Amino acid sequence: QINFYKDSYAASASKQDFSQDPSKFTEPVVEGLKAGAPV
Amino acid sequence: QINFYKDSYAASASKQDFSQDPSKFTEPVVEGLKAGAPV
Amino acid sequence: SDRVLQLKLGNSAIVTQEAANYCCAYGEWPNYLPDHEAVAIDKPTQPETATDRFYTLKSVKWEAGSTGWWWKLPDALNNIGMFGQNVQHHYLYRSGFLIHVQCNATRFHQGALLVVAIPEHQRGAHNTNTSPGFDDIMKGEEGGTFNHPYVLDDGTSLACATIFPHQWINLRTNNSATIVLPWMNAAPMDFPLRHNQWTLAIIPVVPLGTRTMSSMVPITVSIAPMCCEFNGLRHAI
Amino acid sequence: SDRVLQLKLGNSAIVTQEAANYCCAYGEWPNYLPDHEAVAIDKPTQPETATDRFYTLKSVKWEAGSTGWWWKLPDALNNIGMFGQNVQHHYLYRSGFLIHVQCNATRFHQGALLVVAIPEHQRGAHNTNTSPGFDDIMKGEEGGTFNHPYVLDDGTSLACATIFPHQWINLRTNNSATIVLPWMNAAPMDFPLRHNQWTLAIIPVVPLGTRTMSSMVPITVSIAPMCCEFNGLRHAI
Amino acid sequence: SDRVLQLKLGNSAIVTQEAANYCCAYGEWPNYLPDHEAVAIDKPTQPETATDRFYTLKSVKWEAGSTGWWWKLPDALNNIGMFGQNVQHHYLYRSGFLIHVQCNATRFHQGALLVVAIPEHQRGAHNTNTSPGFDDIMKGEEGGTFNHPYVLDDGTSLACATIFPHQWINLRTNNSATIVLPWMNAAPMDFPLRHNQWTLAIIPVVPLGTRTMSSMVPITVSIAPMCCEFNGLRHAI
Amino acid sequence: SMMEINNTESAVGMERLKVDISALTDVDQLLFNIPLDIQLDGPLRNTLVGNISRYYTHWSGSLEMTFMFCGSFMATGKLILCYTPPGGSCPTTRETAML
Amino acid sequence: IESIIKTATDTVKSEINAELGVVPSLNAVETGATSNTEPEEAIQTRTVINQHGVSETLVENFLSRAALVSKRSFEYKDHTSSAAQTDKNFFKWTINTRSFVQLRRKLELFTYLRFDAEITILTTVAVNGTYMGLPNLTLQAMFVPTGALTPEKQDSFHWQSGSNASVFFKISDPPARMTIPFMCINSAYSVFYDGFAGFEKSGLYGINPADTIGNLCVRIVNEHQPVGFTVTVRVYMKPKHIKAWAPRPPRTLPYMSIANANYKGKKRAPNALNAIIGNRDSVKTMP
Amino acid sequence: IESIIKTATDTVKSEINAELGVVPSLNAVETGATSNTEPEEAIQTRTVINQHGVSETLVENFLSRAALVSKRSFEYKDHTSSAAQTDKNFFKWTINTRSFVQLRRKLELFTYLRFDAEITILTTVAVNGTYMGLPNLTLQAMFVPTGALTPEKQDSFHWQSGSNASVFFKISDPPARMTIPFMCINSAYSVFYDGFAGFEKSGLYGINPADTIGNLCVRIVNEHQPVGFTVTVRVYMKPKHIKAWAPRPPRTLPYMSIANANYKGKKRAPNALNAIIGNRDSVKTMP
Amino acid sequence: NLIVPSESSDTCSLIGFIAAKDDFSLRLMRDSPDIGQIDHLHAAEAAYQ
Incomplete structure (x- = not known):
C-alpha cells in the first residue's frame, strides 16, 4: 500500500495472486480423463 | 519524491538520467567509421 | 486406446501394448529456447535427429532385495552417441527428456515400481557430516542404487514423492511408464558435466513376487533427449 | 577493395589484407541437398555452426627443395571437432568446402604457389604396376607430399592443372588464396571414410627465394566445410 | 582519403600524407565564449590570425631509453609569438587547441607513441610527501619528461590513459597524430600563468627499434591555439 | 585500454603493456594466453573494463579484445586469436584452440 | 485449466446413480494422476455454498513470515588479551537460509524460489558483571558482497563503506530493517542444486554458486567501555514477492x-531412518 | 549520437559472411577510436532480446553512496591540565574528500564534478574509566565558511552563530543530516587542478581555491561531567544531483x-611502482 | 610466422586492448578490492590542526 521508495522490490508483500492450476500436479497426463468413463 | 523544503537542492537523488553518448569517448574521430569498410 | 503407444523420435521407435497414459511433466512439453529468454548470444547448434532419439541404458536386475535405481540426467547420457559428443564439445546444453521405462513379467508376478522423475535431486549421505563426493553422484550410464529409498536418500520421504512427475509400473496393470520432461533449471542453458537437473528414480514400493518359474525380470530405461540446443563450441575433454 | 576479405563461418573468422578475389569453384556455391535430388529417405542432421566453421590444419614448412603438399577432403577433416564426430557416427555426408590457404613473407621474398583444388584426384604410383595402397592415399590431417608435382602424381601435367578451381599465392602480389568448393560427386551423398572428392594441392611452381634474413616461411591451410548434411546415424568406428 | 590531411590556420599550414583520421576531443569543436556563459563583462580581444596559428615547439630526440615527454597548455605557449604577448598583457584567456604531433621514420623502424591529451593532469611526485614545486610543473616551451610514464606520474595507469583524447603514432601505419581540443575548464576564462588545462603527453609504449642505419628520429609538436579570447588588459609581467 | 599480458618478472613498468613476438622455427606455436579473470589480479584488472567492474559483483555482456601490431612496415605475419569457453582446461596446441 | 480460485469449491446435490459403463470411483494410479472422484459421485450430497477462502495458503502468505536466520552473541569489551578465535567487537556471517531448521524445512518445500528479502536486525545487550545499566550502543551492519573484502578488525578501513551498503542503528531504536532484492544471477534461487560448484572435481556438492549472497559483517561502532558486555545480534529474513516452483517432499529426518x-534419523520412531511414523501394535489396532 | 539507453542492447542473428572489401574485424587503434566490431560481425549470433537494465551504473547511483569523510575521537572532560595540542571538548575540520581513500579513488574517476552534498553526522560516546552509563550529550556542528572566524575554545563567542549554520543534535537521536548545496564558485568542482592557488609562486600546487569549502567546527554544548568521555564524531557525505565530466584512469598506487x-607504490606486486598486476611465470602460463 | 627482413627489428611487439560492448551490463555494487589504506595519509591530521 504505502511505498515511498524508488525501487519496486521495496514494496510490501503482494498477497493477491489467486490463480491456481492444480492440474499440472494432479492431472499431468496427456489425455484428459473423463468423470466416470474408464481409463 | 517527498520534498517539503523550499530549496530544490534539498531533494533526493535524481536517478532517472538514462541518456548516453559513448561516442564522445569511443568514436571521437572526425570521420564516422563504417561497419566493415576499411579505414 | 490409451494402453497402446508408439513413441517415434529420430530413427528410433518404441511400441508398447500395456501403457498407462504417459505423463507430461508439470503439463509442459519440451521446446527450444525462445529469443526473449536466450542468454548466450552465439548461434546454437540443433542436431535434431542425431540427438533427439531414444538411447537405451543398461538394464538392471529387478530382484528380491532390491532397494531402487537412479540415473541422473544428462549424466546418464553424456557419453552415448551424438548426444554425448555434443556435450563434450560444447559448454552449454538445453534439452528436455522423454523417458520410457520398460518392465514386464507374467500374469502371475506382482510388484509395483515408482518411476519418478525428481528435479534437482540433491542427494545426501547417511550418518556423516561429509557431503557426497563426485563418484557418489556422477555414475554415468551405469546409474546408482538407492541406499535408503524410503527417504529418497535426501531426508525427505518416498511417500510424498508423488508430488514429482511420476508413473507406476504395476505389473498387473501395465508394463511400461513414460514421462516427458521439459527443461528444468533456473537458467536457460547449463553446463552438463557439473550439474544434473533430472534424476530418474525407479523404486520397488511393492517387491517382485510370484510362485511360478523364477525367471529374470529386468528393468530397462530408454531416454530420448528432446529439443537439444548446444552453445559454446570448443574442443573435447 | 578486393584485396581485403573477412570470411565469417560459425564462431570462426579469417581476415586477410592481401587477398586475390576469391574463387567459387565452377561458379557454384554450396547448398543443401534439395528434395528432388535426395536419395536417402531419413531426415538428415544439419549441425550448422558446429561443423560449418574453419578448421585449421597443421602448417607445412615451405622450404627450398619442396615439391608440394596435398590434403584430401574430407579425409583431412574426418577426425577434427564436430565435423569429425558427425563423420564417425553417420554413413553419409554431404558438404562443400571453403578452403583458405595462408602464406606470407617479406617484400624481399619471391615464390609462387599453385593452390589448386582437384576433383577426384585418383593418384598413381611411380614405376610400378601396383595401385597406391590405403596408407598412400588416406593421410588424414597431416596430408601428403607430391612425389612428382610436375605430373601431379597421376601422369597428367602440372601445366594444364589450371583447368581445375585454383588460385595463386604470388608473394609479391598476395599472401592468401581462397577457393569455395561445392558438392562434387556423381551421387548426392557419400561415405566419407572410403572416398575423397576434393584434393587441395599446393605446389611450388616458383620456389621460395630471397637474400635477406632466412626466416621460416610456413604455409597454413584453413578449411571450412559448408552446408554439411549427414545421414545414416549409427555407432562410431 | 583519410590518410592525407592539410590543417590551415592563420598563415600556417601543415600537410601530412600518413594521417590517422584526426581526433576531436570529446566530440567537441572549439568555439568562442557565448553571451549566456560569459562572466567577465569587458569586451574581449579576439586576435584571430595573430594567435590562431600553429606554433612549433622544440623537437625532442626519440631515443632508446626514453620514458616520455609532456607539455602543459597554455604554459608551453605563454612566451611564443602573439599568443604569448596576449597572455602577458591580459588577466584572462580562453582557447581551444589543435595539436599536431609529427614523428616519421623508415619502413624498417618500429615503435608506438601514445599521443594523449590529459585534462587537468595534476601531477604527483615520487617517494615524498611534498607536492611538486613550481619548477617541476611550469616547464614552458621546453616541456618535461615522464619520471614514471607507466603510472602517468600521478599514481594512475598508462594502460587506462586511452580514456582521454588520444591518438597513436604507430610507425608502420602513420607518422602523425592530430587532436583538436576545446576549452576545458570549470570556469569560462582562466588565468593562464597559474593554471594549465591540457597536458599533451607523448609516451613510448613500444620503443624505437630497427636494424638499419641508426638515424636520429625526433618527435615534433605543433600546437595551434583556436578561438582565442583575452580579457582584463593590463601591463605585462 | 591496455592489458598487462606481460605481467612477468623482468618486465619492468611500461614493458608489461606489450607482448614481444619473434620469428619461430616450429609450426603452430603458442605466443601468449590471457587469464580472463577480472576478479583475480590478472591482465584484465587494470583496464577501464576491469576497474569499473570491480566496483560491482555481477556482470553480463560481450567483451572485445583489440590487438595492435607494432612491428615495422616490412614485418609480415599471421596470428590466430582463440577464445575457448570454459568446461575444459586451457588449450595448449593450436589444433585444440581453433575449435 | 488455470483459473482464479478465491474460495473453496461448492458442493452440488446428487441423486441415486446406477449406470453401466460409468465408474467414477475406479481410478488408475499407474497413470501418475490423482483420483478425480468427486464427492458427488461417491455419496449422495446436498448443495453446499462453500464460503471458505483460500487466501492463507497462498505461497506469498505461506512464506512471508519473518524467521530467524542468524544469531551471535559476541563480547563487547577490550580484546587485547583475547583469543584469535573470538569475535572481537564484530562478526562476519556468510548469508544462508540453512542455519535454523524452521525456515529451512519450509523453504525446502520447493525446488526454485524467487523472492525479495526483507531483512530485520534485532540487537540485545547484556552486562557480563556488578550491574550499572545498558548502554545505547551504535552498530554497523555492512553488506559485503561476493569478491569484496571483509573487515578483519573493528577499527578496520573496510568499514568506510564507499560502496558497500551499511546500516547504522542503535539498540534503543526499533530494529534495523532493509530489503535485499532478488539477488541471484539466475531467474530463481536453486533451493536444491544437484551439481558441483566448480569445473574441477574438487568442488562442493549441493550449493549453487548462484545461490551465494555474500557476507553480513556487523560491528559495534563504539569504542569499548571500561566493562564488558555480551551483545547478541539476531537477523530475521522475511521473503516477499515470492514466486515458487516444483514442490518437494518435506524433510522428515533431522538435519x-x-x-x-x-541424514541420520532419530534413534526410534517417529522420524527415524526405518520408521517415520511411530509404531502401533498392528494395522487393525485403533487407540 | 546521444540516445536514451535504459537496457543493454539486443543481439540480431547473423549469417555466413564472406565479402570482399568488407573487413569489420579489422580496425585502426591509431585513430584513437575504440573498435566498432560487432558480435554479429565476428561470429554467427542468434537473436537475443536483452532485458538487462543499466540503471545501477548511472553516475548518480555510482556516486550517491554515503561514504565516511571525517572521524575524530576527542576527550570530553575538564581540560585545565591538558596539552594545547589536544582537542578540548571541540574540534575543527577543513572539509575535504581526500582523507579516506574509498571515496577518494571513486571521486577521482572524474575530472569535474557538480553535486549537492547530503551530510550525515554520527556521534559515538564511550567512558574512559569504572562504568556508570553513557550521557545523552548535545553537540553543535557549526558550518564556518571561508574567511569567517573559527572558534578557539568550547565556550567561545563564535558558537553564537548569528549567521553560520549550526545544527544541534543529541547522541541518542538519529544522526544529524543536512544538505550542503553545490557550493563552488565555478560550474563544477575541480577534482584535479593542474595549477597553483595564488598569483605568487609560493602557492600550493594541486588544490583549486574554488574547491575550498570551509571548516566544520563541532563542539559538545554540555559542560564537562565529573568523569571523562571519549566522543567520536563520524561525518558521512553522500553526493546527489551529480553531473560528472571527463573520466580518468583510476588510482592504482596507494595514496x-x-x-x-x-605516489610510492607497494613494495611488491600488485600495485607496485614497476608492476601493478602481480606476476606470473610467463605470458603462456595459465594457472 | 613473423617474417621480417634483415634491417627490420627481428622482434616485433603487440599491444592488446580490451573494452566492453554495448550489451555489457553491471550490477550489485560493492567496494573495489583495489584501493586500501592502513594508517596515516599525510596532512590528514593537519586538516584538524
Whole structure:
C-alpha cells in the first residue's frame, strides 16, 4: 500500500495472486480423463 | 519524491538520467567509421 | 486406446501394448529456447535427429532385495552417441527428456515400481557430516542404487514423492511408464558435466513376487533427449 | 577493395589484407541437398555452426627443395571437432568446402604457389604396376607430399592443372588464396571414410627465394566445410 | 582519403600524407565564449590570425631509453609569438587547441607513441610527501619528461590513459597524430600563468627499434591555439 | 585500454603493456594466453573494463579484445586469436584452440 | 485449466446413480494422476455454498513470515588479551537460509524460489558483571558482497563503506530493517542444486554458486567501555514477492549440516531412518 | 549520437559472411577510436532480446553512496591540565574528500564534478574509566565558511552563530543530516587542478581555491561531567544531483597524502611502482 | 610466422586492448578490492590542526 521508495522490490508483500492450476500436479497426463468413463 | 523544503537542492537523488553518448569517448574521430569498410 | 503407444523420435521407435497414459511433466512439453529468454548470444547448434532419439541404458536386475535405481540426467547420457559428443564439445546444453521405462513379467508376478522423475535431486549421505563426493553422484550410464529409498536418500520421504512427475509400473496393470520432461533449471542453458537437473528414480514400493518359474525380470530405461540446443563450441575433454 | 576479405563461418573468422578475389569453384556455391535430388529417405542432421566453421590444419614448412603438399577432403577433416564426430557416427555426408590457404613473407621474398583444388584426384604410383595402397592415399590431417608435382602424381601435367578451381599465392602480389568448393560427386551423398572428392594441392611452381634474413616461411591451410548434411546415424568406428 | 590531411590556420599550414583520421576531443569543436556563459563583462580581444596559428615547439630526440615527454597548455605557449604577448598583457584567456604531433621514420623502424591529451593532469611526485614545486610543473616551451610514464606520474595507469583524447603514432601505419581540443575548464576564462588545462603527453609504449642505419628520429609538436579570447588588459609581467 | 599480458618478472613498468613476438622455427606455436579473470589480479584488472567492474559483483555482456601490431612496415605475419569457453582446461596446441 | 480460485469449491446435490459403463470411483494410479472422484459421485450430497477462502495458503502468505536466520552473541569489551578465535567487537556471517531448521524445512518445500528479502536486525545487550545499566550502543551492519573484502578488525578501513551498503542503528531504536532484492544471477534461487560448484572435481556438492549472497559483517561502532558486555545480534529474513516452483517432499529426518542434505534419523520412531511414523501394535489396532 | 539507453542492447542473428572489401574485424587503434566490431560481425549470433537494465551504473547511483569523510575521537572532560595540542571538548575540520581513500579513488574517476552534498553526522560516546552509563550529550556542528572566524575554545563567542549554520543534535537521536548545496564558485568542482592557488609562486600546487569549502567546527554544548568521555564524531557525505565530466584512469598506487597526488607504490606486486598486476611465470602460463 | 627482413627489428611487439560492448551490463555494487589504506595519509591530521 504505502511505498515511498524508488525501487519496486521495496514494496510490501503482494498477497493477491489467486490463480491456481492444480492440474499440472494432479492431472499431468496427456489425455484428459473423463468423470466416470474408464481409463 | 517527498520534498517539503523550499530549496530544490534539498531533494533526493535524481536517478532517472538514462541518456548516453559513448561516442564522445569511443568514436571521437572526425570521420564516422563504417561497419566493415576499411579505414 | 490409451494402453497402446508408439513413441517415434529420430530413427528410433518404441511400441508398447500395456501403457498407462504417459505423463507430461508439470503439463509442459519440451521446446527450444525462445529469443526473449536466450542468454548466450552465439548461434546454437540443433542436431535434431542425431540427438533427439531414444538411447537405451543398461538394464538392471529387478530382484528380491532390491532397494531402487537412479540415473541422473544428462549424466546418464553424456557419453552415448551424438548426444554425448555434443556435450563434450560444447559448454552449454538445453534439452528436455522423454523417458520410457520398460518392465514386464507374467500374469502371475506382482510388484509395483515408482518411476519418478525428481528435479534437482540433491542427494545426501547417511550418518556423516561429509557431503557426497563426485563418484557418489556422477555414475554415468551405469546409474546408482538407492541406499535408503524410503527417504529418497535426501531426508525427505518416498511417500510424498508423488508430488514429482511420476508413473507406476504395476505389473498387473501395465508394463511400461513414460514421462516427458521439459527443461528444468533456473537458467536457460547449463553446463552438463557439473550439474544434473533430472534424476530418474525407479523404486520397488511393492517387491517382485510370484510362485511360478523364477525367471529374470529386468528393468530397462530408454531416454530420448528432446529439443537439444548446444552453445559454446570448443574442443573435447 | 578486393584485396581485403573477412570470411565469417560459425564462431570462426579469417581476415586477410592481401587477398586475390576469391574463387567459387565452377561458379557454384554450396547448398543443401534439395528434395528432388535426395536419395536417402531419413531426415538428415544439419549441425550448422558446429561443423560449418574453419578448421585449421597443421602448417607445412615451405622450404627450398619442396615439391608440394596435398590434403584430401574430407579425409583431412574426418577426425577434427564436430565435423569429425558427425563423420564417425553417420554413413553419409554431404558438404562443400571453403578452403583458405595462408602464406606470407617479406617484400624481399619471391615464390609462387599453385593452390589448386582437384576433383577426384585418383593418384598413381611411380614405376610400378601396383595401385597406391590405403596408407598412400588416406593421410588424414597431416596430408601428403607430391612425389612428382610436375605430373601431379597421376601422369597428367602440372601445366594444364589450371583447368581445375585454383588460385595463386604470388608473394609479391598476395599472401592468401581462397577457393569455395561445392558438392562434387556423381551421387548426392557419400561415405566419407572410403572416398575423397576434393584434393587441395599446393605446389611450388616458383620456389621460395630471397637474400635477406632466412626466416621460416610456413604455409597454413584453413578449411571450412559448408552446408554439411549427414545421414545414416549409427555407432562410431 | 583519410590518410592525407592539410590543417590551415592563420598563415600556417601543415600537410601530412600518413594521417590517422584526426581526433576531436570529446566530440567537441572549439568555439568562442557565448553571451549566456560569459562572466567577465569587458569586451574581449579576439586576435584571430595573430594567435590562431600553429606554433612549433622544440623537437625532442626519440631515443632508446626514453620514458616520455609532456607539455602543459597554455604554459608551453605563454612566451611564443602573439599568443604569448596576449597572455602577458591580459588577466584572462580562453582557447581551444589543435595539436599536431609529427614523428616519421623508415619502413624498417618500429615503435608506438601514445599521443594523449590529459585534462587537468595534476601531477604527483615520487617517494615524498611534498607536492611538486613550481619548477617541476611550469616547464614552458621546453616541456618535461615522464619520471614514471607507466603510472602517468600521478599514481594512475598508462594502460587506462586511452580514456582521454588520444591518438597513436604507430610507425608502420602513420607518422602523425592530430587532436583538436576545446576549452576545458570549470570556469569560462582562466588565468593562464597559474593554471594549465591540457597536458599533451607523448609516451613510448613500444620503443624505437630497427636494424638499419641508426638515424636520429625526433618527435615534433605543433600546437595551434583556436578561438582565442583575452580579457582584463593590463601591463605585462 | 591496455592489458598487462606481460605481467612477468623482468618486465619492468611500461614493458608489461606489450607482448614481444619473434620469428619461430616450429609450426603452430603458442605466443601468449590471457587469464580472463577480472576478479583475480590478472591482465584484465587494470583496464577501464576491469576497474569499473570491480566496483560491482555481477556482470553480463560481450567483451572485445583489440590487438595492435607494432612491428615495422616490412614485418609480415599471421596470428590466430582463440577464445575457448570454459568446461575444459586451457588449450595448449593450436589444433585444440581453433575449435 | 488455470483459473482464479478465491474460495473453496461448492458442493452440488446428487441423486441415486446406477449406470453401466460409468465408474467414477475406479481410478488408475499407474497413470501418475490423482483420483478425480468427486464427492458427488461417491455419496449422495446436498448443495453446499462453500464460503471458505483460500487466501492463507497462498505461497506469498505461506512464506512471508519473518524467521530467524542468524544469531551471535559476541563480547563487547577490550580484546587485547583475547583469543584469535573470538569475535572481537564484530562478526562476519556468510548469508544462508540453512542455519535454523524452521525456515529451512519450509523453504525446502520447493525446488526454485524467487523472492525479495526483507531483512530485520534485532540487537540485545547484556552486562557480563556488578550491574550499572545498558548502554545505547551504535552498530554497523555492512553488506559485503561476493569478491569484496571483509573487515578483519573493528577499527578496520573496510568499514568506510564507499560502496558497500551499511546500516547504522542503535539498540534503543526499533530494529534495523532493509530489503535485499532478488539477488541471484539466475531467474530463481536453486533451493536444491544437484551439481558441483566448480569445473574441477574438487568442488562442493549441493550449493549453487548462484545461490551465494555474500557476507553480513556487523560491528559495534563504539569504542569499548571500561566493562564488558555480551551483545547478541539476531537477523530475521522475511521473503516477499515470492514466486515458487516444483514442490518437494518435506524433510522428515533431522538435519545434520547446513552444507548438505545428509541424514541420520532419530534413534526410534517417529522420524527415524526405518520408521517415520511411530509404531502401533498392528494395522487393525485403533487407540 | 546521444540516445536514451535504459537496457543493454539486443543481439540480431547473423549469417555466413564472406565479402570482399568488407573487413569489420579489422580496425585502426591509431585513430584513437575504440573498435566498432560487432558480435554479429565476428561470429554467427542468434537473436537475443536483452532485458538487462543499466540503471545501477548511472553516475548518480555510482556516486550517491554515503561514504565516511571525517572521524575524530576527542576527550570530553575538564581540560585545565591538558596539552594545547589536544582537542578540548571541540574540534575543527577543513572539509575535504581526500582523507579516506574509498571515496577518494571513486571521486577521482572524474575530472569535474557538480553535486549537492547530503551530510550525515554520527556521534559515538564511550567512558574512559569504572562504568556508570553513557550521557545523552548535545553537540553543535557549526558550518564556518571561508574567511569567517573559527572558534578557539568550547565556550567561545563564535558558537553564537548569528549567521553560520549550526545544527544541534543529541547522541541518542538519529544522526544529524543536512544538505550542503553545490557550493563552488565555478560550474563544477575541480577534482584535479593542474595549477597553483595564488598569483605568487609560493602557492600550493594541486588544490583549486574554488574547491575550498570551509571548516566544520563541532563542539559538545554540555559542560564537562565529573568523569571523562571519549566522543567520536563520524561525518558521512553522500553526493546527489551529480553531473560528472571527463573520466580518468583510476588510482592504482596507494595514496600518500591528502594534499597532492604523490605516489610510492607497494613494495611488491600488485600495485607496485614497476608492476601493478602481480606476476606470473610467463605470458603462456595459465594457472 | 613473423617474417621480417634483415634491417627490420627481428622482434616485433603487440599491444592488446580490451573494452566492453554495448550489451555489457553491471550490477550489485560493492567496494573495489583495489584501493586500501592502513594508517596515516599525510596532512590528514593537519586538516584538524
